[PDB]
């Protein structure tokens, strides 16, 4: 009974045609991944930082150890080409199966094969499909482990000497560490899982997740839902869609905060400095300039009575002054050599700041993730000249929007699944209007 | 007779004068906490060092504010995005100085409002209604999340979230314009179109229905008495109203399907307000309004100002003046 504008709901019980939509659409994802990589490659200029060039995919590939050497310098562009071509080529195969199953294949599958066919209300079959996909996902997270440990390693921005690709030989398995992150507060100085700051913990976390997904998958193939779960949920295609939309929404919001605060699995060498980083780098920059002129940056009192360059955080740590007081939780490889136990060390600041650190601060301060929609870089009052918007701003804003709408989609499809399952999604029966059989409130 | 099942029956009862429900079990205490703390702080809280520079701003009535100037002041920039509950302060005195009440109120309120939205879903299901009123409410709800939580997360400090006050609100919107050029941002433009259009269509719809009321009354009685609550017949004449509006414009620009019409009414402002909430949420990560500063120059290279460059002079005066003691270095990067 659906109109053209709700026309894909006509597919709910056409498992064959619905398989074709899912696989054709899978092909578009892979097509975009491929085409877009080649586009970025054809535009890439290695003399320029990735983040001055509008790249979002090449940074993901380089983060994995391909194409780069010490300091994040690109040494070999061929790995990027391969990733693009292979994704591009593979989308024709998904395209092919997609349109074959949407147009020509059997439109329902359950007559052709009891293994591939399914009924949404069939809880055993549904958890079996779920189980298979849980195993696939566990395999995938183990591929990341394999890369890091057996096929060249990962880019490590924290590596000594400017960052480098490093093979991960001792992934963290200690569950007090791995699950410690799940239980950290999401507030400042804590950061829930966004604070993971070293690749040992990244890889070990993926060993755990792979084993959990494979175990979870086998668990769901072998079992059916317990009665308490049977009575908690709505068991319908649209209900399952609504569950996953909610889960995508949660994940989109997390990805937003990851690319905005995390500079370990989103290295600033490729993605540009974070907001906190850039702002810390401004104070560093002018600390250096001023100290070189003779200023005693530790004893300089600013207009407010707080230190012009250096102050204490609320728990006492020595931190940068000015508005960046708010970003003192920031940690980065260019800054950590100056940190002592009480926070920034005044004797290291006076004696041990290196030219590469001065360069890096200047670079990050002048590439802060601020820019206009037409890609004029810098604060909103800046004149035209610099064509820059940080990849982190692009990746944060896009995924906030998508996460928001998928939460709207969750509420849409969840409320509708509840209503359709109870039998009043099309409206109130005039002859059995529930409120007319209820007593008045007053 | 089971105790838990009786309590379940009361929580979800459709006979309670106000529906409680499972979403209400969380909403009731969180909103009471946020309301009680808000009222106490608006009347009696002492000055709060919003910007972390030991320059406290007085928000409450007893400390020399009126209704227009008063505010619960955001938490200290020294705190940033750190969680600052009462029990993390050495004393209430400290917690008040540093803006603790703002955190308590906005976290409790955002939770309670989230549950308000779910409560809207829930009672619709107990009454056998269709479910999407809550989807309409997600537009205002997303807007409060944007100015109380999202924008702070991206800028790094609850001190840049929206004060809970009338003049505080205006301060937030002037500074937003200087730091993001929100007016030149298309998602705020859709928000204005959502809100202007919503008011337009509110008036239109109200005036067209009012215009076609069926004479049921005398000139000595309010026409409102021509409709009796729960009567089955429509009370106006949609065909006469369609025939008036189709002629004011032209026929195919007028609705005669009342379902399409009211869906249009729902969707236009809701979608416009989604976009403007998304505008704030994405200017949280500094993807700002269009910049046409010095975009027109002449054959020699002279700048030829436009109305955008004049906007920029205004933005500059906001920029250079705001938080006038708080910046030591030449770029306001957050």
């Amino acid at each position: 009974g659906f109109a053209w504008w709700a026309g894909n709901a006509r597919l709910i019980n056409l498992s064959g045609k619905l398989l074709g939509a899912h696989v054709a659409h899978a092909g578009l994802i892979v097509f975009w991944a491929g085409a877009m990589t080649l586009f970025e490659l054809a535009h890439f200029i290695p003399e320029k930082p990735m983040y001055e060039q509008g790249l979002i995919l090449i940074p993901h590939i380089a983060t994995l150890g391909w194409g780069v050497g010490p300091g994040g310098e690109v040494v070999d562009t061929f790995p990027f080409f391969v990733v693009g071509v292979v994704h591009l080529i593979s989308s024709a195969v998904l395209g092919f199966g997609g349109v074959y199953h949407a147009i020509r294949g059997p439109e329902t599958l359950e007559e052709y094969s009891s293994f591939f066919g399914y009924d949404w209300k069939d809880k055993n079959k549904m958890t079996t499909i779920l189980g298979f996909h849980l195993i696939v996902l566990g395999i995938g997270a183990l591929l990341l482990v394999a890369k890091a440990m057996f096929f060249g390693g990962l880019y490590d921005t924290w590596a000594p000497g400017g960052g480098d690709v490093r093979v991960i030989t001792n992934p963290t398995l200690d569950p007090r560490v791995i699950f410690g992150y799940l239980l950290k507060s999401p507030f400042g100085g804590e950061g829930w899982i966004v604070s993971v700051n070293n690749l040992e913990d990244v890889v070990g976390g993926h060993i755990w997740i792979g084993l959990i997904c494979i175990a979870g998958g086998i668990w769901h193939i072998l079992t059916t839902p317990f009665g308490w779960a049977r009575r908690a949920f709505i068991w319908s295609g649209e209900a399952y869609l609504s569950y996953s939309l909610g889960a995508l929404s949660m994940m989109g919001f997390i990805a937003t905060c990851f690319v905005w605060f995390n500079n370990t699995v989103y290295p600033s060498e490729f993605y540009g400095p974070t907001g906190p980083e850039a702002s810390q780098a401004q104070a560093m920059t002018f600390l250096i300039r001023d100290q070189k002129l003779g200023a005693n940056v530790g004893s300089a009192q600013g207009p407010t009575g707080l230190g012009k360059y250096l102050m204490r955080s609320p728990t006492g740590e020595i931190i940068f002054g000015g508005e960046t007081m708010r970003f003192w939780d920031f940690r980065g490889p260019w800054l950590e050599p100056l940190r002592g136990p009480n926070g920034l060390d005044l004797n290291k600041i006076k004696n041990d700041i290196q030219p590469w650190q001065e360069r890096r601060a200047a670079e990050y301060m002048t590439h802060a993730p601020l820019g206009s929609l037409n890609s004029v870089g810098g604060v909103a009052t800046e004149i035209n000249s610099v064509n820059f918007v940080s990849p982190r701003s692009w990746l944060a804003t896009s995924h906030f929007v998508l996460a928001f709408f998928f939460l709207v989609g969750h509420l849409w499809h969840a409320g509708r699944a509840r209503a359709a399952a109870a039998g009043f999604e099309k409206g109130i029966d005039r002859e059995s209007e529930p409120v007319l059989s209820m007593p008045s409130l007053d | 007779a089971n105790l838990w099942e009786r309590f379940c029956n009361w929580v979800t009862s459709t006979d309670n004068r106000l529906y409680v429900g499972w979403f209400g079990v969380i909403m009731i205490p969180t909103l009471l906490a946020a309301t009680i703390c808000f009222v106490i702080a608006f009347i009696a809280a002492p000055p709060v060092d919003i910007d972390g520079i030991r320059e406290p701003v007085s928000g409450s009535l007893l400390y020399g504010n009126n209704i227009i100037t008063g505010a619960v002041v955001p938490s200290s920039n020294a705190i940033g995005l750190h969680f600052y509950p009462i029990w993390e302060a050495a004393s209430l005195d400290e917690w008040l100085y540093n803006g603790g009440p703002y955190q308590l109120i906005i976290f409790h309120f955002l939770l309670g409002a989230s549950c308000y939205m779910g409560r809207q879903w829930e009672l619709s299901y107990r009454l056998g209604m269709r479910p999407w009123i809550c989807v309409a409410y997600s537009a205002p709800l997303a807007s409060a999340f944007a100015v109380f939580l999202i924008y702070p997360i991206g800028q790094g400090s609850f001190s840049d979230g929206m004060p809970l006050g009338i003049s505080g609100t205006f301060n937030f919107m002037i500074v937003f314009q200087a730091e993001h050029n929100i007016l030149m941002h298309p998602f705020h433009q859709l928000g204005v179109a959502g809100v202007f259009g919503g008011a337009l269509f509110c008036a239109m719809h109200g005036s067209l229905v009012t215009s076609s009321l069926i004479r049921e009354t005398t000139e000595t009685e309010s026409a409102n008495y021509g409709y009796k609550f729960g009567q089955e017949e429509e009370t106006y004449n949609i065909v006469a109203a369609h025939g008036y509006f189709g002629r004011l414009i032209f026929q195919y620009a007028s609705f005669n399907n009342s379902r399409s019409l009211h869906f249009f009414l729902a969707a236009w402002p809701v979608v416009g307000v989604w976009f403007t909430a998304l505008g704030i949420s994405t200017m949280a990560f500094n993807l700002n309004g269009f910049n046409f500063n010095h975009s027109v120059i002449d054959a020699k290279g002279n700048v030829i100002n436009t109305w955008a460059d004049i906007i920029n002079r205004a933005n500059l005066g906001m920029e250079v003046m705001h938080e006038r003691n708080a910046h030591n270095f030449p770029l306001d990067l957050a």
């Binding site: 008045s440 007053d442 | 004068r17 009535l61 007893l62 009126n66 209704i67 009796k228 609550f229 729960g230």
Partner: peptide, 30 residues
Amino acid sequence: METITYVFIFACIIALFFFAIFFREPPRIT
């Protein structure tokens, strides 16, 4: 005196809410 006035008005609005809700004219059908 102005603080007392502001709070007094706000308090009357809250009391009105209570009567508006619990002591409304009950809507009656047909």
